[PDB]
Design a protein around this ligand. Structure first.
Ligand SMILES: Nc1ncnc2c1ncn2[C@@H]1O[C@H](COP(=O)(O)OP(=O)(O)NP(=O)(O)O)[C@@H](O)[C@H]1O
Ligand SMILES: [Mn+2]
Ligand SMILES: [Mn+2]
Ligand SMILES: [Mn+2]
Lengths: 235, 230
């Protein structure tokens, strides 16, 4: 896809809002939404302004102004927006120099793939990440001067086999280290994992599989295909 | 021992508390055992004092012989509950292994370290627990002891180690197993006249009908932990 094809997309489908996404230094996705008329051909080169001093590990208040440059190849509809919203992944431009920002993790990533091509060893590096997670029903944490606490909860949690539940306690709570990978009613996350897998596919992610993981109390994993460095970190 | 058990229970009740002498009330923590020290004496003199192993006499070694040889049968009287076998489990904390040793608190029979005093020379049978009838448990252990001197049972060689392990004879793993060992080996009790064959038979019958069989019938909560999904 190209800047013009994305602009034609917005005009044809009457998309009113654009959600531009970009990563910060530690690894948290940041975003800013814009009314359709704010995105033109120049947004894909010069970028859109923002405060680079409120993003962790970036600019200092005195040299704050930065630019968001969206990638046309990342455009899809964000399903989590009631209002049909087009979403794009950005890279960060330094407005002072006009060059890509040296602290932008997505710039570093592109530079790494540019370096590989420069050595003559290879032209492509394929990365296949396998990120396990926990699906919790509750989380309570805090720490004051006289306290420190965390309380994680899940219906699958083995620590909950003797508890009174609303109408009532249906058993089948996986045992510790025994979640990989008994069927339902032990596995309570089949429908949700399929939804997680199918919705990210519509976002442009190459999808493969899904399974319940070793841990009791919601450990899960979704399987996605490898891709080129930047594409894989985008995925 | 009966007074001991009575005052403890009653002072606990006085202070609004409750006492149990059951071997294993708490899982993954120490059980309640009744280690029983014993020694034979004649004309005021200690007969278990000598120049053999751990400062013991040949008679003392022989008394241990009997105890160790008759230990599985002795357990029908010294450990007479299904719960006894939750404490007498290999590992936590022993004494599952039928051997004598000095200082070793992992052996069935322990010879405590006496301060060079003949009067303090004795064996500690560690297997018993406080669910036993002390009158029956003590009479039984005496009988096995005497038979050991009279036959003249070699206790074997001491085991001075912590924790191949199949080389050493083991105690019964259940109440029925101890009751089986009593049916096979009860002549050291009966032939004496102390216990009647009538009593020995009624003991096995009462324990099977009122404890072994009712227990086999009842589902255990941990069976839900292991088997609810299947
Ligand atoms: N030649 C390759 N280069 C890079 N990644 C690859 C390559 N081939 C496969 N992969 C990816 O590596 C990931 C591995 O998933 P999978 O095929 O299940 O291997 P796995 O080792 O059995 N997974 P796991 O059991 O959790 O360790 C997927 O993203 C694959 O697409
Ligand atoms: Mn995994
Ligand atoms: Mn996998
Ligand atoms: Mn002791």
């Amino acid at each position: 896809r190209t800047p013009q094809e994305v602009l034609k997309w917005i005009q044809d489908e009457n998309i009113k809002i654009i959600d531009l996404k970009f990563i910060d230094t530690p690894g948290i996705w940041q975003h800013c939404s814009f009314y359709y008329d704010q995105l033109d051909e120049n947004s894909f080169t010069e970028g859109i302004p923002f405060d680079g001093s409120s993003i962790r590990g970036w600019k200092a208040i005195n040299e704050s102004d930065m630019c968001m440059v969206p990638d046309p190849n990342t455009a899809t509809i964000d399903p989590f927006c009631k209002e049909p919203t087009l979403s794009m992944i950005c890279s960060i431009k330094e407005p002072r120099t006009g060059e890509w920002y040296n602290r932008d993790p997505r710039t570093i990533a592109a530079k790494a793939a540019e370096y590989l091509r420069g050595t003559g060893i290879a032209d492509t590096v394929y990365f296949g990440p396998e990120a396990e997670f926990f699906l919790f029903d509750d989380i309570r944490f805090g720490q004051t001067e006289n306290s420190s606490y965390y309380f994680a909860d899940s219906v699958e949690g083995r620590w909950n086999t003797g508890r009174e539940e609303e109408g009532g306690n249906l058993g089948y709570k996986p045992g510790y280290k025994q979640g990989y990978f008994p069927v339902a009613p032990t596995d309570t996350a089949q429908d949700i994992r399929t939804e997680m897998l199918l919705t990210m596919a519509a976002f442009g992610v190459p999808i493969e599989k899904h399974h319940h993981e070793v841990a009791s109390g919601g450990q899960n994993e979704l399987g996605i295909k490898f891709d080129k460095l930047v594409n894989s970190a985008d995925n | 021992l009966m007074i001991y058990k009575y005052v403890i229970k009653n002072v606990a009740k006085k202070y609004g508390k409750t006492v149990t002498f059951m071997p294993k009330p708490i899982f993954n923590d120490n059980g309640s055992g009744m280690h029983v020290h014993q020694s034979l004496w004649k004309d005021g003199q200690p007969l278990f004092a000598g120049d053999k192993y751990a400062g013991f006499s040949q008679m003392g070694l022989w008394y241990i012989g009997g105890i160790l040889k008759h230990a599985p049968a002795l357990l029908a009287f010294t450990n007479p509950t299904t719960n006894s076998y939750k404490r007498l489990v290999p590992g936590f904390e022993a004494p599952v292994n039928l051997a004598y040793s000095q200082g070793n608190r992992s052996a069935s029979v322990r010879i405590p370290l006496s301060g060079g005093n003949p009067k303090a020379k004795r064996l500690e049978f560690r297997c018993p627990d406080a669910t036993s009838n002390p009158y029956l448990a003590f009479a039984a252990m005496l009988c096995a002891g005497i038979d050991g001197i009279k036959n003249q049972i070699d206790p074997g060689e001491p085991l001075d180690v912590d924790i191949e392990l199949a080389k050493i004879p083991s105690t019964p793993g259940s109440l029925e197993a101890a009751l089986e060992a009593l049916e096979k080996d009860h002549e050291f009790l009966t032939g004496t006249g102390v216990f009647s064959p009538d009593f020995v038979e009624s003991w096995i019958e009462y324990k099977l009908d009122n404890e072994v069989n009712p227990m086999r019938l009842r589902p255990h909560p941990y069976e839900f932990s292991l088997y609810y999904d299947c």
